[PDB]
Protein backbone atom coordinates (compact mmCIF):
# COMPACT_ATOMS: atom_id res chain seq x y z
CA UNK A 1 0.00 0.00 0.00
CA UNK A 2 0.88 3.49 0.11
CA UNK A 3 2.25 4.78 3.60
CA UNK A 4 0.34 7.98 5.34
CA UNK A 5 3.06 9.37 4.63
CA UNK A 6 3.34 9.02 0.82
CA UNK A 7 -0.79 10.01 0.68
CA UNK A 8 0.07 13.25 2.27
CA UNK A 9 2.81 14.03 0.11
CA UNK A 10 1.21 13.28 -3.03
CA UNK A 11 -1.38 15.84 -1.67
CA UNK A 12 0.70 18.36 -1.14
CA UNK A 13 2.64 18.24 -4.39
CA UNK A 14 -1.06 17.78 -6.16
CA UNK A 15 -1.99 20.96 -4.32
CA UNK A 16 0.89 22.72 -5.65
CA UNK A 17 0.39 22.14 -9.45
CA UNK A 18 -3.29 22.86 -8.91
CA UNK A 19 -1.92 26.46 -7.62
CA UNK A 20 0.07 26.95 -10.14
CA UNK A 21 -2.79 26.21 -12.60
CA UNK A 22 -4.41 28.85 -10.91
CA UNK A 23 -2.45 31.54 -10.09
CA UNK A 24 0.09 30.80 -12.57
CA UNK A 25 4.16 30.09 -13.08
CA UNK A 26 6.57 31.83 -14.59
CA UNK A 27 10.75 30.72 -15.54
CA UNK A 28 12.32 30.18 -12.79
CA UNK A 29 9.27 29.09 -10.69
CA UNK A 30 9.99 25.19 -9.00
CA UNK A 31 8.22 22.45 -10.30
CA UNK A 32 6.73 19.09 -8.40
CA UNK A 33 6.29 15.82 -8.75
CA UNK A 34 6.20 12.68 -6.74
CA UNK A 35 9.43 11.00 -7.68
CA UNK A 36 10.01 7.23 -5.24
CA UNK A 37 7.25 8.16 -3.50
CA UNK A 38 9.15 11.75 -2.28
CA UNK A 39 8.03 15.18 -4.04
CA UNK A 40 10.44 16.17 -6.11
CA UNK A 41 11.06 20.10 -7.46
CA UNK A 42 12.97 21.42 -10.47
CA UNK A 43 12.57 24.32 -12.45
CA UNK A 44 10.06 25.84 -14.79
CA UNK A 45 12.11 26.31 -18.30
CA UNK A 46 10.60 28.54 -21.07
CA UNK A 47 9.61 25.06 -22.74
CA UNK A 48 7.43 24.44 -20.07
CA UNK A 49 5.85 27.69 -19.78
CA UNK A 50 5.31 27.21 -23.61
CA UNK A 51 3.62 23.77 -23.16
CA UNK A 52 0.94 25.04 -20.65
CA UNK A 53 -2.21 25.20 -22.23
CA UNK A 54 -2.22 29.13 -21.30
CA UNK A 55 1.50 29.87 -21.41
CA UNK A 56 1.49 29.82 -17.57
CA UNK A 57 -0.90 32.81 -17.02
CA UNK A 58 -3.12 30.82 -15.17
CA UNK A 59 -6.48 30.29 -14.73
CA UNK A 60 -7.14 33.88 -12.71
CA UNK A 61 -5.32 36.13 -14.95
CA UNK A 62 -6.71 34.60 -17.97
CA UNK A 63 -10.62 36.02 -16.48
CA UNK A 64 -8.98 38.76 -15.89
CA UNK A 65 -8.07 39.29 -19.81
CA UNK A 66 -11.09 38.26 -20.66
CA UNK A 67 -13.37 41.00 -18.30
CA UNK A 68 -10.76 43.57 -20.20
CA UNK A 69 -11.62 42.29 -23.98
CA UNK A 70 -15.43 41.46 -22.79
CA UNK A 71 -15.92 45.32 -21.85
CA UNK A 72 -13.61 46.78 -24.42
CA UNK A 73 -15.41 45.02 -27.16
CA UNK A 74 -18.79 45.86 -25.82
CA UNK A 75 -17.85 49.33 -26.07
CA UNK A 76 -16.90 49.13 -30.03
CA UNK A 77 -20.00 47.42 -30.31
CA UNK A 78 -21.96 50.14 -28.57
CA UNK A 79 -20.35 52.34 -30.48
CA UNK A 80 -21.20 50.42 -33.75
CA UNK A 81 -24.79 50.60 -32.62
CA UNK A 82 -25.15 54.00 -32.27
CA UNK A 83 -23.29 55.09 -35.73
CA UNK A 84 -25.91 52.18 -37.33
CA UNK A 85 -28.67 54.66 -35.74
CA UNK A 86 -26.96 57.47 -36.79
CA UNK A 87 -26.89 56.36 -40.32
CA UNK A 88 -30.63 54.82 -40.35
CA UNK A 89 -31.54 58.65 -39.19
CA UNK A 90 -29.63 60.05 -42.23
CA UNK A 91 -30.44 57.45 -44.96
CA UNK A 92 -34.55 58.12 -43.96
CA UNK A 93 -33.85 61.93 -44.16
CA UNK A 94 -31.98 61.39 -47.33
CA UNK A 95 -34.81 58.64 -48.96
CA UNK A 96 -37.42 61.33 -48.19
CA UNK A 97 -35.46 64.32 -49.98
CA UNK A 98 -35.31 61.63 -53.27
CA UNK A 99 -39.08 60.88 -53.35
CA UNK A 100 -39.09 64.92 -53.11
CA UNK A 101 -37.31 65.87 -55.71
CA UNK A 102 -38.54 62.82 -58.02
CA UNK A 103 -42.19 64.39 -57.41
CA UNK A 104 -40.52 67.88 -58.48
CA UNK A 105 -38.82 65.86 -61.70
CA UNK A 106 -42.26 64.50 -62.57
CA UNK A 107 -43.92 67.87 -62.06
CA UNK A 108 -41.65 70.04 -64.01
CA UNK A 109 -41.77 67.45 -67.02
CA UNK A 110 -44.41 69.84 -68.11
CA UNK A 111 -43.66 70.34 -72.04
CA UNK A 112 -96.84 128.41 -123.21
CA UNK A 113 -94.40 130.79 -121.87
CA UNK A 114 -91.61 129.84 -124.86
CA UNK A 115 -94.02 129.88 -127.58
CA UNK A 116 -95.48 133.46 -126.63
CA UNK A 117 -91.30 134.16 -125.92
CA UNK A 118 -90.97 132.78 -129.76
CA UNK A 119 -93.89 135.13 -131.40
CA UNK A 120 -91.93 137.65 -129.87
CA UNK A 121 -88.42 137.40 -130.74
CA UNK A 122 -89.77 137.37 -134.46
CA UNK A 123 -90.28 141.01 -134.25
CA UNK B 1 11.80 18.17 8.91
CA UNK B 2 8.08 18.60 8.61
CA UNK B 3 6.44 15.91 10.10
CA UNK B 4 3.66 13.55 8.40
CA UNK B 5 1.15 15.44 9.99
CA UNK B 6 2.37 18.56 9.25
CA UNK B 7 2.42 17.57 5.41
CA UNK B 8 -0.81 16.41 5.78
CA UNK B 9 -2.62 19.15 7.70
CA UNK B 10 -0.86 21.48 5.09
CA UNK B 11 -2.22 20.01 2.28
CA UNK B 12 -5.66 19.95 3.64
CA UNK B 13 -5.50 23.53 4.24
CA UNK B 14 -4.04 24.20 0.30
CA UNK B 15 -7.06 22.51 -0.66
CA UNK B 16 -9.49 24.00 0.82
CA UNK B 17 -7.95 27.66 -0.55
CA UNK B 18 -7.85 26.45 -3.79
CA UNK B 19 -11.88 24.88 -3.67
CA UNK B 20 -12.69 28.58 -2.19
CA UNK B 21 -10.54 29.75 -5.37
CA UNK B 22 -12.71 27.93 -7.77
CA UNK B 23 -15.84 28.04 -5.95
CA UNK B 24 -16.14 31.57 -4.31
CA UNK B 25 -16.41 32.63 -0.91
CA UNK B 26 -18.73 34.88 1.05
CA UNK B 27 -18.79 36.95 3.96
CA UNK B 28 -18.45 34.86 7.21
CA UNK B 29 -16.87 31.98 5.54
CA UNK B 30 -13.90 30.48 7.44
CA UNK B 31 -10.51 31.38 5.78
CA UNK B 32 -8.02 28.67 6.85
CA UNK B 33 -4.26 29.39 6.70
CA UNK B 34 -1.20 26.86 9.00
CA UNK B 35 0.04 28.54 11.80
CA UNK B 36 2.59 26.48 14.28
CA UNK B 37 1.78 24.10 11.84
CA UNK B 38 -2.10 23.46 12.50
CA UNK B 39 -4.72 25.10 10.61
CA UNK B 40 -6.33 27.82 11.83
CA UNK B 41 -9.82 29.49 10.86
CA UNK B 42 -10.95 32.78 10.47
CA UNK B 43 -14.16 34.25 9.65
CA UNK B 44 -13.99 36.31 5.86
CA UNK B 45 -14.66 39.66 6.31
CA UNK B 46 -16.01 41.97 3.77
CA UNK B 47 -12.43 43.22 3.40
CA UNK B 48 -11.90 39.86 2.52
CA UNK B 49 -14.29 39.81 -0.11
CA UNK B 50 -13.28 42.89 -1.97
CA UNK B 51 -9.48 41.82 -1.70
CA UNK B 52 -10.02 38.26 -3.63
CA UNK B 53 -9.30 39.09 -7.27
CA UNK B 54 -12.74 38.22 -8.40
CA UNK B 55 -14.52 39.64 -5.16
CA UNK B 56 -15.06 36.09 -3.78
CA UNK B 57 -17.05 35.36 -6.83
CA UNK B 58 -14.63 32.14 -7.75
CA UNK B 59 -13.63 30.79 -10.90
CA UNK B 60 -16.76 28.91 -12.17
CA UNK B 61 -18.93 31.81 -11.47
CA UNK B 62 -16.79 34.12 -13.37
CA UNK B 63 -16.64 31.86 -15.90
CA UNK B 64 -20.67 31.48 -16.02
CA UNK B 65 -20.83 35.19 -16.37
CA UNK B 66 -18.89 35.15 -19.09
CA UNK B 67 -21.00 32.35 -20.88
CA UNK B 68 -23.99 35.23 -20.53
CA UNK B 69 -21.99 38.21 -21.59
CA UNK B 70 -20.74 35.99 -24.64
CA UNK B 71 -23.78 34.92 -25.77
CA UNK B 72 -26.00 38.34 -25.31
CA UNK B 73 -23.12 39.95 -26.80
CA UNK B 74 -23.28 37.79 -29.88
CA UNK B 75 -26.81 38.46 -30.42
CA UNK B 76 -26.24 42.11 -30.29
CA UNK B 77 -23.69 41.68 -32.89
CA UNK B 78 -25.78 39.50 -35.28
CA UNK B 79 -28.57 42.53 -34.95
CA UNK B 80 -25.77 44.90 -36.10
CA UNK B 81 -25.31 42.68 -38.78
CA UNK B 82 -28.66 42.09 -40.07
CA UNK B 83 -28.80 45.93 -40.02
CA UNK B 84 -25.73 46.59 -41.80
CA UNK B 85 -27.43 44.55 -44.58
CA UNK B 86 -30.89 46.08 -44.72
CA UNK B 87 -29.25 49.61 -44.60
CA UNK B 88 -26.77 48.44 -47.60
CA UNK B 89 -29.57 47.39 -49.42
CA UNK B 90 -31.64 50.64 -48.86
CA UNK B 91 -28.70 52.81 -49.79
CA UNK B 92 -27.91 50.45 -53.13
CA UNK B 93 -31.68 51.37 -53.70
CA UNK B 94 -31.35 55.19 -53.40
CA UNK B 95 -27.90 55.13 -55.12
CA UNK B 96 -29.92 54.09 -58.12
CA UNK B 97 -32.77 57.06 -57.89
CA UNK B 98 -30.21 59.32 -57.69
CA UNK B 99 -28.71 58.32 -60.56
CA UNK B 100 -31.95 58.28 -62.37
CA UNK B 101 -33.14 61.58 -61.40
CA UNK B 102 -29.38 63.03 -62.47
CA UNK B 103 -30.13 61.68 -65.96
CA UNK B 104 -33.63 63.20 -65.97
CA UNK B 105 -32.38 66.42 -64.34
CA UNK B 106 -29.71 66.37 -67.22
CA UNK B 107 -32.24 65.29 -69.98
CA UNK B 108 -34.75 67.44 -68.76
CA UNK B 109 -32.99 70.62 -69.07
CA UNK B 110 -33.76 71.01 -73.02
CA UNK B 111 -34.14 74.83 -73.39
CA UNK B 112 -67.17 109.02 -154.52
CA UNK B 113 -70.33 108.12 -152.84
CA UNK B 114 -69.96 111.26 -150.30
CA UNK B 115 -68.73 113.70 -153.81
CA UNK B 116 -72.48 112.35 -155.48
CA UNK B 117 -74.47 113.33 -151.98
CA UNK B 118 -72.63 116.95 -152.21
CA UNK B 119 -73.63 117.31 -155.76
CA UNK B 120 -77.07 116.43 -154.74
CA UNK B 121 -77.91 118.55 -151.96
CA UNK B 122 -76.70 121.57 -153.84
CA UNK B 123 -79.92 121.39 -155.15
CA UNK C 1 -10.09 13.68 16.32
CA UNK C 2 -9.20 12.81 12.84
CA UNK C 3 -6.31 10.75 12.40
CA UNK C 4 -3.07 11.84 10.28
CA UNK C 5 -4.29 9.26 7.78
CA UNK C 6 -7.95 10.55 7.18
CA UNK C 7 -6.16 14.01 6.97
CA UNK C 8 -4.11 12.92 4.40
CA UNK C 9 -6.70 10.93 2.69
CA UNK C 10 -8.97 13.15 2.90
CA UNK C 11 -6.51 16.07 1.21
CA UNK C 12 -5.71 13.33 -1.56
CA UNK C 13 -9.58 13.41 -2.23
CA UNK C 14 -9.83 16.87 -2.22
CA UNK C 15 -7.01 17.12 -4.78
CA UNK C 16 -8.44 15.03 -6.91
CA UNK C 17 -11.59 16.93 -7.24
CA UNK C 18 -10.30 20.29 -7.77
CA UNK C 19 -8.56 18.20 -10.30
CA UNK C 20 -11.06 16.96 -12.20
CA UNK C 21 -12.54 20.75 -12.10
CA UNK C 22 -9.80 22.23 -13.80
CA UNK C 23 -9.62 19.54 -16.28
CA UNK C 24 -12.19 18.00 -16.78
CA UNK C 25 -14.38 14.49 -16.71
CA UNK C 26 -16.19 11.93 -18.85
CA UNK C 27 -18.17 9.48 -18.68
CA UNK C 28 -16.28 6.41 -17.25
CA UNK C 29 -13.86 8.41 -14.86
CA UNK C 30 -13.51 8.01 -11.67
CA UNK C 31 -15.07 10.15 -8.93
CA UNK C 32 -13.95 10.28 -5.48
CA UNK C 33 -14.96 10.97 -1.71
CA UNK C 34 -14.66 9.99 1.73
CA UNK C 35 -16.71 7.33 2.92
CA UNK C 36 -15.88 5.90 6.59
CA UNK C 37 -12.92 8.03 6.70
CA UNK C 38 -11.84 6.38 3.57
CA UNK C 39 -11.42 7.26 -0.34
CA UNK C 40 -14.33 5.71 -2.03
CA UNK C 41 -14.06 5.77 -6.14
CA UNK C 42 -16.90 5.12 -8.65
CA UNK C 43 -18.11 5.47 -12.03
CA UNK C 44 -18.88 8.93 -13.51
CA UNK C 45 -22.18 8.36 -15.67
CA UNK C 46 -23.60 10.98 -17.90
CA UNK C 47 -26.12 11.97 -15.30
CA UNK C 48 -22.73 13.36 -13.06
CA UNK C 49 -21.35 14.83 -16.61
CA UNK C 50 -24.82 16.55 -16.87
CA UNK C 51 -24.79 17.73 -13.44
CA UNK C 52 -21.37 19.46 -13.57
CA UNK C 53 -21.76 23.16 -13.93
CA UNK C 54 -19.76 23.10 -17.26
CA UNK C 55 -21.09 19.71 -18.54
CA UNK C 56 -17.51 18.27 -17.40
CA UNK C 57 -15.54 20.42 -19.60
CA UNK C 58 -13.58 21.60 -16.46
CA UNK C 59 -11.76 25.24 -16.57
CA UNK C 60 -9.33 25.19 -18.72
CA UNK C 61 -11.24 23.90 -21.97
CA UNK C 62 -14.20 26.45 -21.10
CA UNK C 63 -11.31 29.04 -21.24
CA UNK C 64 -10.34 28.00 -24.29
CA UNK C 65 -13.11 28.06 -25.75
CA UNK C 66 -13.77 31.67 -25.08
CA UNK C 67 -10.49 32.78 -26.53
CA UNK C 68 -11.94 31.10 -29.55
CA UNK C 69 -15.40 32.50 -29.55
CA UNK C 70 -13.68 36.20 -28.14
CA UNK C 71 -11.05 35.68 -31.21
CA UNK C 72 -14.17 35.11 -33.65
CA UNK C 73 -16.51 37.70 -32.64
CA UNK C 74 -13.84 40.61 -32.77
CA UNK C 75 -13.43 39.27 -36.22
CA UNK C 76 -17.09 40.01 -36.87
CA UNK C 77 -17.30 43.44 -34.86
CA UNK C 78 -14.27 44.24 -37.29
CA UNK C 79 -15.89 43.57 -40.05
CA UNK C 80 -18.86 45.51 -39.15
CA UNK C 81 -16.68 48.88 -38.40
CA UNK C 82 -15.30 48.43 -41.89
CA UNK C 83 -18.93 48.40 -43.43
CA UNK C 84 -20.12 51.01 -41.42
CA UNK C 85 -17.18 53.36 -42.64
CA UNK C 86 -18.20 52.54 -46.02
CA UNK C 87 -22.09 52.85 -45.87
CA UNK C 88 -20.72 55.99 -44.29
CA UNK C 89 -18.69 57.13 -47.22
CA UNK C 90 -21.29 56.22 -49.36
CA UNK C 91 -23.78 58.05 -47.75
CA UNK C 92 -22.14 60.95 -47.42
CA UNK C 93 -21.77 60.81 -51.28
CA UNK C 94 -25.09 60.27 -51.67
CA UNK C 95 -26.18 63.30 -49.44
CA UNK C 96 -23.86 65.92 -52.01
CA UNK C 97 -25.28 64.13 -55.07
CA UNK C 98 -28.97 64.86 -53.71
CA UNK C 99 -28.50 68.82 -52.71
CA UNK C 100 -27.19 69.54 -56.08
CA UNK C 101 -29.75 67.74 -58.28
CA UNK C 102 -32.25 69.70 -55.40
CA UNK C 103 -30.20 73.20 -56.65
CA UNK C 104 -30.72 71.98 -60.27
CA UNK C 105 -34.40 71.41 -59.83
CA UNK C 106 -34.73 74.47 -58.12
CA UNK C 107 -32.58 76.39 -60.98
CA UNK C 108 -34.27 74.34 -63.78
CA UNK C 109 -37.93 75.65 -62.32
CA UNK C 110 -37.34 78.19 -64.99
CA UNK C 111 -40.81 79.50 -66.37
CA UNK C 112 -54.20 146.85 -129.69
CA UNK C 113 -52.58 144.38 -132.27
CA UNK C 114 -55.80 142.77 -132.07
CA UNK C 115 -58.18 145.91 -133.04
CA UNK C 116 -55.57 146.37 -135.69
CA UNK C 117 -56.75 142.83 -136.78
CA UNK C 118 -60.34 143.02 -137.40
CA UNK C 119 -60.41 146.31 -139.04
CA UNK C 120 -58.10 144.51 -141.72
CA UNK C 121 -60.21 141.47 -141.74
CA UNK C 122 -63.33 144.26 -142.39
CA UNK C 123 -61.74 144.24 -145.92
Chains 1, 2, 3 share one sequence.
Do not use: C, M, W
Not at 54 to 72: M, P, R, Y
Amino acid sequence: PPSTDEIAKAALVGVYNNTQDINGFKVGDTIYDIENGQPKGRPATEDDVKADDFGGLGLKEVLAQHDQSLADLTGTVEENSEALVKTAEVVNDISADVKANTAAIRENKAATANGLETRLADA
